[PDB]
């Protein structure tokens, strides 16, 4: 980013935003990844064990992505509407 002596593109443009420390400990979980665990019950801990989310992860959503066939009990996790619907269809249970 040296443009002769003209003020380079980065320096021209204003800085913005801030980093969220809470974003680094959240996670997104596909529907496909609910089968990868064992026991048919999906906690954070379980996910971690199954190497789906990672050790420093306090929070995790389940997104409508891929597809779930087996019935699953999602526990202590956020779920999107679509994802939730999918889970229901599969024959699964959801709980806070």
């Amino acid at each position: 980013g040296f443009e002769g002596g003209q003020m380079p593109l980065y320096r021209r443009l204003p800085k913005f935003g801030f980093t969220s420390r809470k974003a680094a400990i959240t996670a997104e979980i596909r529907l496909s990844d609910l089968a990868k665990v064992e026991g048919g019950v999906v906690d954070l801990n379980t996910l971690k064990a199954a190497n789906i989310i990672g050790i420093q992860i306090e929070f995790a959503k389940v997104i409508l992505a891929g597809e779930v066939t087996t019935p699953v009990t999602v526990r202590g996790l956020r779920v999107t509407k679509g994802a939730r619907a999918a889970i229901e269809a599969a024959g699964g249970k959801i709980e806070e």
Partner: protein
Amino acid sequence: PKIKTVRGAAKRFKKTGKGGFKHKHANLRHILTKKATKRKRHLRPKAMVSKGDLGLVIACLPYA
């Protein structure tokens, strides 16, 4: 050694879904009362980086 990121660049740009780069417009920072409101409004939203200076940005930000 690992490539170092240009930290300023990182601060100023965010990579998008198709490998683009959004950025905040210039000219909406001070000396505002004189600027027409419409112009200001236009400036507000984030803007994609142009084809010309894309390369430079990329160079600056190897880890994106």
